[PDB]
Design a protein around this ligand. Structure first.
Ligand SMILES: Nc1nc2c(ncn2[C@@H]2O[C@H](COP(=O)(O)OP(=O)(O)NP(=O)(O)O)[C@H](O)[C@H]2O)c(=O)[nH]1
Ligand SMILES: [Mg+2]
Lengths: 172, 477
């Protein structure tokens, strides 16, 4: 058995908790609210026989983006993910900022960058929904471990993307 | 321009007539004080400009002119020349202390000497020379004290002399020195904010030894004067309140039963934390002081304390000490007042101090003190309100603290607090076999590692008792 910590970061009002409630508390859609501070969730996965893994999801509040993103949150962290809404290019620039900040202020025992995944949130909304051609530019330029479309309300691809990301994380 | 200055400094080396040299020095001082250029700071920094002047002043002590203007000249030179302090060291302290000793009994001669001493002591590495002299600098300044500038300069000085006089030196000082300041100036300059600041922090510096608290509490003079200063002198001054607060924090002991004064200082502390919540300046000292004094007092205000603690955690997440003191204060308040159990929580109108405490624990695993205080706090919170049970459990507290006690094992207090927190968390709940396998071995190893300590054994046994009691096949393993 093992335990791990994953930090969810992104822009404001993108429904960060929605995804973390869907994956752990089995709560999807719901009202749109503002996350004042850092909140926690627990996940248990039976990845293999006699090998059960625990995950601590920390959904960092993105309201204070201009404020110094303290390394204490990323301290002892084992994984991270950037999730941005697909209705704003400002969210895309914010995701680039999160990528730069984590690359600057995150370390691993082996020294290699920890896996990162580009989550295209709530794709089930018009009009900028399936613009994967534009997303591929940053997908290959940023050197991210993965990229995958998702919809928090519908939970269309949260589970497969999370499984791929966690399999990549234990692959290291 | 510089040619005249060269002529003046050349004439200064003659040392022929005292009156003529005095007039030349006065003219040079008058010309040097200007904003035209840095000609006076011509980077020469020659001691020949001022070392013969101080030699003449020391040798011919009756010459009041060189005493009156040479100190002003060197003060202006230091205020103008940037590297003058660098030219001081790498002596002059002996010269200035002899100047203060032999013939500085006049007010005009004293004030310039004390001002020069005050500005010189802002450089550093010269205080050791000042404290190792033969002129009895402490006796000199004590004999100096009765004019306002003298006092505001008597303090702003001494402030640094108390850094290493000796705990014993302070003890000798407590017998007679306190009067030459507390009596001498707090009453006298009651309307001098900087003087009050210097006096209060000098009291702070002398309050280091433990034996002197009885002397400071001989007639409750320290408590009364600091309370009056906080109430009247500084309604809206951060530095005064911070210094008085640090006095409050360092003046808490077995004699805390200053009931009426207790109430007073409690109120003042609240005022402080409500009027400057932006730095460690007040938060840490007041919260620790407040926690002990609230325990003593309780044997409204509680809501204000909850709010102050919540902002204390919110605005100073990066400092271990602030969070430790704040969560300790929250614990000590909640221990004596359980009515506010519903007043705290995730709901609107209630401070979400739970997630903040947990975040503190995670972000400062390296310190045992923060873990101890925050663990005790949230354990008392969980014992107070049953609703919070199984919510932190669903939030990832159990295996997380198990890993923390795995990381921190060399101390018994951390293990005892962890076992108590597990006991009060897992009470009234039923777990699965996986939770059993994830909990029982780690706590058993912790109990084995600390076998001698009775409280750890008691808490561990209580936790195991509350936690022990297809499916049958798994349970057998
Ligand atoms: N258009 C649209 N809105 C959705 C969909 N699913 C959820 N939402 C809305 O988006 C909202 C986001 O609110 P919330 O999760 O509280 O935001 P947050 O990102 O956690 N706040 P913070 O940025 O501070 O972390 C709610 O999830 C819901 O009202 C969807 O498929 N489409
Ligand atoms: Mg959120």
């Amino acid at each position: 058995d093992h335990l791990f910590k994953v930090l969810v970061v992104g822009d404001a009002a993108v429904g960060k908790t929605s995804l973390v409630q869907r994956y752990s508390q089995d709560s999807f859609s719901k009202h749109y609210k503002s996350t004042v501070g850092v909140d926690f969730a627990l996940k248990v996965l039976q990845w293999s026989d006699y090998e059960i893994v625990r995950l601590q999801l920390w959904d960092i509040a993105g309201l204070e983006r201009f404020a110094a993103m303290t390394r204490l949150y990323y301290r002892d962290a084992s994984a991270c993910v950037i999730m941005f809404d697909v209705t704003n290019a400002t969210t895309f620039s914010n995701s680039q900022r999160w990528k730069q900040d984590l690359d600057s202020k995150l370390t691993l025992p082996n020294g290699e960058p920890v896996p990162c995944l580009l989550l295209a949130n709530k794709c089930d909304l018009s009009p900028w929904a399936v613009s994967r051609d534009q997303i591929d530019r940053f997908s290959k330029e940023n050197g991210f471990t993965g990229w995958t479309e998702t919809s928090v309300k519908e939970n269309k691809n949260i589970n497969e993307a999370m499984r791929v990301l966690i399999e990549k994380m234990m692959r290291n | 321009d510089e040619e005249t200055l060269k002529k003046l400094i050349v004439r200064l080396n003659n040392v022929q007539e005292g009156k003529q040299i005095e007039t030349l020095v006065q003219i040079l001082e008058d010309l040097l004080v200007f904003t035209y250029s840095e000609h006076a700071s011509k980077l020469f920094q020659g001691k020949n400009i001022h070392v013969p002047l101080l030699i003449v002043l020391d040798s011919y002590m009756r010459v009041a002119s060189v005493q009156q203007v040479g100190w002003s000249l060197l003060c202006k030179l230091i205020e103008v020349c940037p590297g003058t302090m660098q030219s001081l060291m790498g002596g002059v302290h002996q010269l200035i202390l002899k100047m203060l000793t032999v013939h500085n009994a006049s007010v005009n001669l004293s004030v310039i000497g004390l001002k020069t001493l005050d500005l010189l002591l802002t450089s550093g590495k010269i205080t050791l020379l000042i404290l190792d002299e033969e002129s009895d600098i402490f006796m000199l300044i004590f004999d100096a004290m009765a004019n306002d500038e003298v006092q505001k300069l008597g303090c702003k000085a001494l402030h640094v002399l108390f850094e290493r006089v000796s705990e014993e030196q302070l003890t000798e000082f407590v017998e007679n020195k306190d009067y030459m300041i507390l009596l001498s100036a707090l009453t006298n300059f009651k309307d001098e904010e900087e003087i009050v600041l210097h006096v209060l922090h000098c009291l702070h510096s002398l309050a280091i030894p433990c034996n002197n608290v009885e002397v400071l509490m001989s007639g409750n003079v320290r408590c009364y004067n600091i309370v009056v200063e906080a109430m009247k002198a500084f309604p809206m001054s951060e530095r005064i309140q911070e210094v008085s607060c640090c006095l409050l924090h360092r003046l808490t002991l077995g004699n805390f039963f200053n009931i009426l004064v207790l109430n007073e200082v409690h109120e003042f502390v609240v005022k402080a934390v409500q009027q400057y919540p932006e730095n460690a300046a007040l938060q840490i000292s007041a919260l620790s002081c407040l926690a002990l004094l609230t325990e003593t007092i309780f044997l409204e205000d509680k809501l204000f304390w909850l709010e102050a603690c919540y902002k204390a955690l919110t605005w100073h997440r990066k400092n271990k000490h602030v969070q430790e003191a704040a969560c300790w204060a929250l614990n000590n308040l909640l221990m004596y007042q359980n009515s506010l159990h519903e007043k705290i929580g995730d709901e609107d109108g209630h401070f979400p101090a739970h997630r903040e405490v947990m975040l503190s624990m995670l972000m400062h695993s390296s310190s045992k003190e923060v873990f101890q205080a925050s663990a005790n706090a949230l354990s008392t919170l969980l014992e107070q309100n049953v609703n919070f049970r199984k919510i932190l459990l669903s939030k990832g507290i159990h295996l997380n603290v198990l890993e923390l006690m795995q990381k921190h094992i060399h101390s018994p207090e951390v293990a005892e607090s962890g076992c108590k927190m597990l006991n009060h968390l897992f009470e009234g709940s039923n777990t699965s076999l996986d939770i059993m396998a994830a909990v029982v071995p780690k706590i058993l190893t912790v109990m084995k590692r600390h076998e001698t300590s009775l409280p750890v054994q008691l808490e561990a046994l209580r936790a195991i008792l509350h936690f022990i009691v297809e499916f049958h096949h798994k349970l057998n393993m």
